[PDB]
Amino acid sequence: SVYDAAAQLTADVKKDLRDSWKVIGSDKKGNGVALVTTLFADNQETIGYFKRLGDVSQGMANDKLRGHSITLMYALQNFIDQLDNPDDLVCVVEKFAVNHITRKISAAEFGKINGPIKKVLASKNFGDKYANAWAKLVAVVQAAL
Binding residues: 100
* Minimum gap (Å) between residue 138 Cβ and a copy of itself: 18
Q: Is 87 in the site for a copy of itself (CB under 8 A)?
A: yes
Query: Which residue in the set 20, 32, 38, 100 belongs to the binding site for ligand HEM (CB under 6 A)?
Result: 100
Bind-site residues for heme b: 100
Residues 6+ apart with CB under 8 A from 47: 40, 56
Q: Which does 92 bind (CB under 5 to 8 A by kind): ligand HEM, a copy of itself, none?
A: a copy of itself
Show contacts with ligand HEM in window 7-36 (CB under 6 A).
Answer: none
* Minimum gap (Å) between residue 127 Cβ and a copy of itself: 28
Q: Is 94 in the site for a copy of itself (CB under 8 A)?
A: yes
Q: Summarize as ranges the residues that interact with a copy of itself (CB under 8 A).
A: 28-29, 52, 63-64, 66-68, 70-71, 74-75, 77-78, 81-82, 87-88, 90-92, 94-96, 98
